[PDB]
Paper text:
AcrAB-TolC is the major multidrug resistance efflux pump in [name], where [name] is the efflux transporter residing in the inner membrane of the bacterium, playing an important role in capturing and expelling a range of structurally diverse substrates. [name] is homotrimeric with the three monomers suggested to cycle between three conformational states known as loose/access, tight/binding, and open/extrusion during substrate export. Crystallographic studies of [name] have revealed that large substrates e.g. erythromycin bind the proximal pocket in the access/loose monomer (access binding pocket) while smaller substrates e.g., doxorubicin and minocycline bind the distal pocket in the binding/tight monomer (deep binding pocket).The proximal and distal sites are separated by a short “gate” loop (herein defined to consist of residues 615FGFAGR620) that has been suggested to regulate the progress of substrates through the export pathway. During efflux, large substrates such as erythromycin are proposed to undergo a sequential export process, first binding the proximal pocket, then passing the gate loop to the distal pocket, and subsequently being extruded out of the cell via TolC.
The second, [name](ΔLoop), lacks the entire gate loop, due to substitution of residues 615–620 by a single glycine. The X-ray diffraction data obtained for [name] crystals in the presence of erythromycin revealed electron density consistent with this antibiotic occupying the proximal pocket. The occupancy of erythromycin was estimated at 0.89 for the wild type structure, and 0.86 and 0.88 for the [name](AAA) and [name](ΔLoop) variants, respectively. The one major difference between the gate loop variant structures and the wild type is the lack of a contact between erythromycin and the central phenylalanine residue of the gate loop (Phe617). The absence of Phe617 in the gate loop variants does not lead to lower occupancy of erythromycin relative to wild type [name]. No evidence of erythromycin bound to the distal pocket was seen for the wild type [name] or either gate loop variant. The results presented here suggest that disruption or even removal of the gate loop is not enough to facilitate occupation of the distal pocket by erythromycin—at least in crystallographic soak experiments involving isolated [name]. Strains expressing gate loop variants were both found to be highly susceptible to erythromycin, when compared to those expressing the wild type (MICs: wild type [name] 500μM (or 367 μg/mL), [name](AAA) 125μM (92 μg/mL), [name](ΔLoop) 62.5μM (46 μg/mL), [name]-negative control 31.25μM (23 μg/mL)). The work reconfirms the importance of the gate loop in the [name] erythromycin-export mechanism while establishing that the interaction with the gate loop is not essential for the binding of erythromycin to the proximal binding pocket.
Numbering used by the authors:
A (entry chain A): 2 to 1039
B (entry chain B), D (entry chain C): 51 to 150
C (entry chain B): 697 to 895
E (entry chain B): 548 to 597
The structure:
């Protein structure tokens, strides 16, 4: 501290080291939009080709679910059992469970469920993965010259790329928009019936003429003495072409005729599956959908993927291009880049102010060189504590520049002050003021971390979010203080120009300095007036109370957010067709969408990626937007875009189409929004539960005063078709039931049979009916079974058939059949209030219908009521700190009474714009109280100290005080408010965030300072005039 | 009894394709032998948890297992951590020509 | 590529492939027609060919209290030379023994005994070192220029050694730039000079 | 249905033999049953990471795999973290129409 | 002296470690493709005896 003033070079090395070290602690740090907020979940996926929802649910799901016991830190278990036969069991865990070991604890129960599973399931593959809900990115592939279709491309993607994107570390799941090539054998039931053959024979045959065999070795081990040739046997090898699959012999007739496969069925290189079809601006395309692994770094993973595709790019087919339809990336990149623009500029700004008030370049380089230092170094406090260069901590740098600048300033200022007052040279001035503000700087560093740590102790994911801020700020704070003892005074004595007693640069050279006179007169005027009021104190007690109360109302009557909405440069439109419609109709709709965007949004939309699939009734489109630069308007930002778009796809359709932008809060809580689970307890049947769901739905639809969008998050029961097989008749006529089953299956369901080698890559062999003979209930008639004897028996020979209901989607939560009911709270009302009303409507449902919460509103029924304790505690701590520093019980109150003066500015700021009491508004509000604290503390400090250590009177000591370190006040706040200025202006990346920070802080700051340099005195005085008895006229000691 | 293209097209490629999403993958290299043995060495990022990576692989293989030949499935598919640095190699012999 | 490097003895040295070459392997083409005709099930022709020359793990037995395996295979002498294929017959559906030369064509071909794969795809490992005089990285670079000289679909990659070095080949100067700035800053500190350190 | 000296030298001893270089193994004790159950308890040094252990232990057992039976292989061999102490025992009874 | 140091530096061989007679080494034998267990064994005996 003192030491360095005689060792400036040692200090410059401490600073240059902090800067270069913060620089290396900057190159190796995480980058993110937000931190990892989402809890770890492990998902179990499996497929049962042809199965129905109730099928998978009773064959795979409960077989897996029941084996999921003894898993550590289990939070909740939810599974979708699909009419598409797929089952997905997401097991979400307590936040910060070891991704990897949990995933191990789950797959080690899946392996006990495995051998008691279907063989179709077991061989199609069961997968366990730690993945996010949302796509890190979606990679497109198209062919510009139309030379190949969607299925061809799907093959290229799945056979030249996808296996290494899924081995890139950090890559959780890839969903493929398309499918890999397969040996597709589409059977003619007639051309089969001719020869009296069944699918089953096709199965056997395929297995037979196409296989590998363990051959062996000529001159094998062990050989006989003298043997001299050793080489391998090559036998039956897997098949290569479609031709050879025709050239398969299924049954030889009496009459010399061969019955080939070629005859009995059509054979083609085709899709393993035809559910999902993808079109990019109408042009056919196949795609890569990347979902992020649990916990891995976004921007790192994505750079690894970019490099993998760059690595593959020189070997692609003629005219085969990659497209990038959806990318969460350049937005986080450009956004944080904008926050950096602010940091650089606000520094340049603070230099501008610093010059104005000190009109001396080398002098002004002291605090301008100062802040660069504290910054660089704080990135280093984080690389030490494991945080990340994320939005919250970056807006932390932005928010902390205020405390940094204020400390550097008060230093260089008190030096200049003493030099101008007493007439001492530099060093002696340094030692003097530094000796004065050291104790002050320490007290302020600890009362400031006395407010900023309690909001660090918040719970839930929200707590991760708030602590990010709390730590970047407290640590940056300690660093500017440490700097303020090392670098700062050193530079004062080094390069601050020595000032002759009584300069005040008053009216010297005129150009730059009528300012000096004018300011001078006004700082006096100011203190004259500080006095004028310091006399009648009563009214100001009142006006203050009024201000308090106002702050309150204004506070309450302000909307509470979570985060900001962001034009993230990329969005989507989503499509839901009426339950059970067909692939082709959905495709119709999606094509409509693609057209709307390429039409009445040509200037904003660059590219559409429509995806039809998963399963026919539903489609979606990833709409990429033309660069931000060419989208100026208030209408060219996503909000109005999706607004007017949804307006299009609302009125002129047969089925509903949401058009929307993905939230910035990737995979977590909305506004006032919850996620209800209706749970079966007694075994009331999918029906009693279903009707119960409709019951809660209807009874909440009854309260528009409380709730909004009471909806199930499933599909309703659609009609399912039952072919009730007569065991007796079929065993009578000579048909084994096994055979009826597998024929009806491999016909209408299909079957994975054998594996083949296409172009050197092992793909699957799927045999199924040709389309036309398996569409209409009628075609049931077209299928026969070769009985025990040698006669074909028609399906209508052993089968009764009828229509019924079934569900396409069977959800299960924590084991039991369940149904997911989303909901939001009324326009004005709190999420929790609406949750209470739901608990109150769901308490009236039938015997055995119970309830629970998940996802977002679990995350909300967890934390709450914490803000008042943490701020009450933060207050008892701050007060206690001030009784400490000021050695009085009664004195501290004065520096506290200041809290409103910053508050009311920010609340009036939010309100008078269109903003909201969110995260940013709150961290900023904190910061503002921070500086208020600073300022006032210094004021009361000098007044007390003058009263005590130079013996002055009350009113006179305060007045002296208020006058003397006023010029710094003003310097700080201009420095800030100007540095803040950009945030509240600009549109471009992240400007929702920016503007949120900025406004609150700027407004806070105005009233803060230019109400405080008038209220702080009054505080101290009325405060002091309620302690001891000697405090005015005082004198004494020397 | 398998030949090089046998194991390459029965075991290897089915295993290689089932080896997805394993943490800190560096590079994956495999031998398919006419001696019937197939070996897939997955070398990982320096200073990764040996034990956690190796568990991740044996649990992706334990999923590729059912899409394998039954001869392979029954001889056993195995996972081990590859140093080549045996502290010791002990030999055992019989002096009076006794056993083979 | 062996040839393209054989053209540069001044840069690269002893460039060699690290595999085994295609050896002559013996192919026994089964005509499905003749065998399905005379009455032998293809399973039978196969697994007899197998358990003959290949061997087969069948059962488990318990030797001296430790479970060991049950391997059944041909005796050595009847499974050594191609002609011996003949000594093996299949019991048909009716009840007759059929020699393999009744439904098996035979020929010699080539195949490789070792199919290498690098990161998923078929690949081939070429080991190598640099000329006596030249730095390893240079020869690695000339290798990237030569494997760039090859036909469509011929790509390249690095592994093992040259991977551990293609990472840490750009780091050496930087840690010592840090070392110099930090040592100088330290001495400037100790003293009180920017210029006294230079001594 | 198998008998004790039957299971023990086929399943028990074959698994126990692979459990060396287990990090912090204190003592290893196992039971071999005619009711067909076979159980191997590994107790460890105080404070070794449980999940870390189970990962290592199932990683030595999945090596003991090639010398264990197929009925044992088919109903499932379990690897788990074990107390030897009930935290509590919850009762369920029926006062009235006394179900069994 | 500086310049001399430079030339000396560049014109000095770049290694990784030094080789150590560890009381033990190995010899490896590659027979003509498809040779026999017994012939490879001939060579191995030859070495063993050498
Ligand atoms: C923007 C981009 C994405 O937005 C969301 O994540 C939407 C808006 C979720 O709703 C909301 C719902 C919410 C808020 O619920 C608490 C939250 O969990 C998710 C992340 O977003 C939905 C419906 C998720 O379901 C939710 O998945 C959860 C694991 C729990 C719950 N369930 C299966 C039991 C279910 O509601 C689910 C599966 O991701 C949707 C599937 C179809 C996708 O993969 C699609 C393509 C998504 O990437 C997306 C639409 O593009
Ligand atoms: C650096 C820029 C800051 C420039 C600030 C210059 C002055 C600020 C504007 C005035 C705001 C405060 O307003 C202040 O209020 C009190 C009234 O209570 C006045 O003071 C007055 O109070 C009573 C009247 O009842 C008298 O005893 C007193 O002599 C009289 O002067 C001050 O003259 C006035 O300055
Ligand atoms: C100097 C001593 C203390 C001085 C502090 C005085 C003013 C400080 C400004 C704080 C006011 C913030 O405004 C209010 O704060 C809490 C969080 O803080 C919010 O509360 C919200 O966040 C947290 C979650 O992390 C939960 O407790 C709560 O369930 C939630 O809805 C309020 O809905 C918000 O409107
Ligand atoms: Ni005056």
């Amino acid at each position: 501290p003192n030491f360095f003033i005689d060792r400036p070079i040692f200090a410059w090395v401490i600073a240059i080291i902090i800067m270069l070290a913060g620089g290396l602690a900057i190159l190796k740090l995480p980058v993110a939009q937000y931190p990892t907020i989402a809890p770890p979940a492990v998902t179990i996926s499996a497929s049962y080709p042809g199965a129905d929802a109730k099928t998978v649910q009773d064959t795979v799901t409960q077989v897996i679910e029941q084996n999921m016991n003894g898993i550590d830190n289990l939070m909740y278990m939810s599974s979708n059992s699909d009419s598409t036969g797929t089952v997905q069991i997401t097991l979400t865990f307590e936040s910060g469970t070891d991704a990897d070991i949990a995933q191990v604890q789950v797959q080690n129960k899946l392996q006990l469920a495995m051998p008691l599973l279907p063989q179709e399931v077991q061989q199609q593959g069961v997968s366990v993965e730690k993945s996010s809900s949302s796509f890190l990115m979606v990679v497109g592939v198209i062919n510009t010259d139309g030379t190949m279709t969607q299925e061809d491309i799907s093959d290229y993607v799945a056979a030249n790329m996808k296996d290494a994107i899924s081995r890139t570390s950090g890559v959780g799941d890839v969903q493929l928009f398309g499918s890999q090539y397969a040996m597709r054998i589409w059977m003619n039931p007639n051309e089969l019936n001719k020869f009296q053959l069944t699918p089953v024979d096709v199965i056997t045959a395929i297995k037979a003429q196409n296989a590998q065999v363990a051959a062996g070795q000529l001159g094998g081990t062990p050989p006989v003495k003298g043997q001299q040739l050793n080489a391998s046997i090559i036998a039956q090898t897997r098949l290569t072409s479609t031709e050879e699959f025709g050239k398969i012999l299924l049954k030889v007739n009496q009459d010399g005729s061969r019955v080939l496969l070629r005859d009995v069925a059509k054979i083609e290189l085709g899709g393993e599956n035809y559910d999902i079809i993808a079109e990019f601006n109408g042009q056919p395309a196949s795609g890569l959908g990347i979902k992020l692994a649990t916990g891995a770094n976004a921007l790192d993973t994505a750079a690894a993927i970019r490099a993998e595709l760059a690595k593959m790019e020189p070997f692609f087919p003629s005219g085969l291009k990659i497209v990038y339809p959806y990318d969460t990336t350049p937005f986080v990149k450009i956004s944080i880049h904008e926050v950096v623009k602010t940091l650089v500029e606000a520094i340049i700004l603070v230099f501008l102010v610093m010059y104005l008030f000190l009109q001396n370049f080398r002098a002004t380089l002291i605090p301008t060189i100062a802040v660069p230092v504290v910054l660089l170094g704080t990135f280093a406090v984080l690389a030490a504590f494991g945080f990340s260069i994320n939005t919250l901590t970056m807006f932390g740098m932005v928010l902390a520049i205020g405390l940094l600048v204020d400390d550097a300033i008060v230093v260089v200022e008190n030096v200049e002050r003493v030099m101008a007052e007493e007439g001492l040279p530099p060093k002696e001035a340094t030692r003097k003021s530094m000796g004065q503000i050291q104790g002050a700087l320490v007290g302020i560093a600890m009362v400031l971390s006395a407010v900023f740590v309690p909001m660090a102790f918040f719970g839930g994911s929200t707590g991760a979010i708030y602590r990010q801020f709390s730590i970047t700020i407290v640590s940056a704070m300690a660093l500017s203080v440490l700097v303020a003892l090392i670098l700062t005074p050193a530079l004062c004595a080094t390069m601050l120009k020595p000032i002759a007693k009584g300069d005040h640069g008053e009216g010297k050279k005129g150009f730059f300095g009528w300012f000096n006179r004018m300011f001078e007169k006004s700082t006096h005027h100011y203190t004259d007036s500080v006095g004028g009021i310091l006399r009648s104190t009563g009214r100001y007690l009142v006006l203050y109370l009024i201000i308090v109360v106002g702050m309150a109302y204004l506070f309450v009557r302000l909307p509470s957010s979570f985060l900001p909405d962001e034009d993230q440069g990329v969005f989507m439109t989503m499509v839901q067709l009426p339950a059970g419609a067909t692939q082709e109709r959905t495709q119709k709709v999606l094509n409509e969408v693609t057209h709307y965007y390429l039409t009445k949004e040509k200037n904003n939309v660059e590219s559409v990626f429509a995806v039809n699939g998963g399963g026919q009734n539903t489609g979606i489109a990833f709409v990429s937007l033309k660069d931000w630069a060419d989208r100026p308007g208030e209408e060219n930002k996503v909000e109005a875009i999706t607004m007017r778009a949804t307006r299009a796809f609302s009125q002129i359709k047969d089925a509903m189409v949401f058009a929307f932008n993905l939230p910035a809060i990737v995979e977590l809580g909305t506004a006032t929004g919850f996620d209800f689970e209706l749970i079966d307890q007694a075994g009331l049947g999918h029906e009693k539960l279903t009707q119960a769901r409709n019951q809660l739905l209807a009874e909440a639809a009854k309260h528009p005063d409380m709730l909004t969008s009471v909806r199930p998050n499933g599909l309703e029961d659609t009609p399912q078709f039952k072919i009730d097989i007569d065991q007796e008749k079929a065993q009578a006529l000579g048909v084994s039931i096994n055979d009826i089953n597998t024929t009806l299956g491999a016909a209408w369901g299909g079957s994975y049979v054998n594996d083949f080698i296409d172009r050197g890559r092992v793909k699957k062999v799927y045999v199924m009916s040709e389309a036309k003979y398996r569409m209409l209930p009628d075609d049931i008639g077209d299928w026969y079974v070769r009985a025990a004897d040698g006669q074909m028996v028609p399906f209508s020979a052993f089968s009764s058939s009828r229509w019924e209901y079934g569900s396409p989607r069977l959800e299960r939560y924590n084991g039991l059949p369940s149904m997911e009911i989303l909901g939001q709270a009324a326009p004005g009302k709190s999420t929790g209030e609406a949750m209470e009303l739901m608990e109150q409507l769901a308490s009236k449902l039938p015997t055995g219908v119970g309830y629970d919460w998940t996802g977002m509103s679990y995350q909300e029924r967890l934390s709450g009521n914490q803000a008042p304790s943490l701020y009450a505690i933060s207050l008892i701590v701050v007060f206690l700190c001030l009784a400490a520093l000021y050695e009085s019980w009664s004195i501290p109150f004065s520096v506290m009474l200041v809290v409103p003066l910053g508050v009311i500015g920010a609340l009036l700021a939010a309100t008078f714009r269109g903003l909201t009491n969110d995260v940013y508004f709150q961290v900023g509000l904190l910061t503002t109280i921070g500086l208020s604290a600073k300022n006032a503390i210094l004021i009361v400090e000098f007044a007390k100290d003058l009263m005590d250590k130079e013996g002055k009177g009350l009113i006179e000591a305060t007045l002296d005080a208020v006058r003397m370190r006023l010029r710094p006040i003003l310097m700080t706040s201009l420095a800030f408010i100007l540095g803040v200025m950009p945030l509240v202006i600009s549109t471009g990346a992240g400007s929702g965030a920016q503007n949120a920070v900025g406004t609150g802080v700027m407004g806070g700051m105005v009233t803060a300072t230019v109400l405080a340099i008038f209220f702080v005195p009054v505080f101290f005085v009325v405060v002091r005039r309620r302690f001891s008895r000697k405090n005015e006229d005082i004198e004494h000691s020397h």
